[PDB]
């Protein structure tokens, strides 16, 4: 993903202030609320019946964590996204059957959450860098689909 050196810098600096169960949990939870069809993967969770329900779900939170952890490690490999996500891309296609469009939606929600959480600090140039990151991650997770 063609980030500039300073864009990489911006992403990392900002990412240092993120707690993830909180942030991962927040991004996944808002995905399920704003785009509720993504819950299709979530019959198991029972109450996802309201926004407060989704956001407080310990299940959602633990999965947010798992998802952003993977996403966090990709920041260490920004020149190797297809590589670092390949066997993960295969899992999501072969076993989990998740339409890659869901990755794009999560990415936009992750951006919205980051803006909400950091406020003015989430400047237009910072956002643009993160938009490349979330696009690169989605594209890497989609790459082994067949």
């Amino acid at each position: 993903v063609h980030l500039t050196p300073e864009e990489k810098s911006a992403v990392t600096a900002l990412w240092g202030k993120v707690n993830v169960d909180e942030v991962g949990g927040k991004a996944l939870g808002r995905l399920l609320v704003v785009y509720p069809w993504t819950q299709r993967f979530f019959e198991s969770f029972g109450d996802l019946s309201t926004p407060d329900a989704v956001m407080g779900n310990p299940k959602v939170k633990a999965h947010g964590k798992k998802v952003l952890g993977a996403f966090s490690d990709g920041l260490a490999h920004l020149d190797n996204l297809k590589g670092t996500f390949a066997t993960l891309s295969e899992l999501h296609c072969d076993k989990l059957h998740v339409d890659p469009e869901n990755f794009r939606l999560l990415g936009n929600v992750l951006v919205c959450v980051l803006a909400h959480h950091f406020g003015k600090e989430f400047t237009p140039p910072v956002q643009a860098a993160y938009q490349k990151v979330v696009a690169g991650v989605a594209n890497a997770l989609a790459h082994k689909y067949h």
């Binding site: 704003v34 509720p36 069809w37 819950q39 059957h97 339409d99 469009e101 869901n102 989609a142 689909y145």
Partner: protein, 141 residues
């Protein structure tokens, strides 16, 4: 909105499809699974190989929905109502996939309609399939 020329072109086109609607449905589905492998994520239970009776039967149903909609072009949200619930409330296919199916239906109609699929008819059929896609996703949230 679908114009009266659109509705005319759609009825003329679908009228020419005739009893092959069902067949063109499955073909549209095969085209979609091959051209756009992500759509296969919604059919983990189906054998999606060429010739699959599951694909053929599902194609018949899709082609049949499109038939009712033509039959009722002036009030498509009614004709299709039962069906938008099903997608909005159960199947939960992301909206982006409807453009992919639509494109593949258009390619199938083009491939079988040497005379009928003029630019004007192509234009009307694309608007019709977008309209169907909009009705089918209208209750999604």
């Amino acid at each position: 909105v679908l114009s009266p020329a659109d509705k005319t072109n759609v009825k003329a086109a679908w009228g020419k499809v005739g009893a092959h609607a069902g067949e063109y449905g499955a073909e549209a589905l095969e085209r979609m699974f091959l051209s756009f492998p992500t759509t296969k994520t919604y059919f983990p239970h189906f054998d999606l190989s060429h010739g699959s009776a599951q694909v053929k039967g599902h194609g018949k149903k899709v082609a049949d929905a499109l038939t009712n909609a033509v039959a009722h072009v002036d009030d498509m949200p009614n004709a299709l109502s039962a069906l938008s619930d099903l997608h909005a409330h159960k199947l939960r296919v992301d909206p982006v996939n409807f453009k992919l199916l639509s494109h593949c239906l258009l390619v199938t109609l083009a491939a079988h309609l040497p005379a009928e699929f003029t630019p004007a008819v192509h234009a009307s059929l694309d608007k019709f399939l977008a309209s169907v896609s909009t009705v089918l996703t209208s209750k999604y949230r």
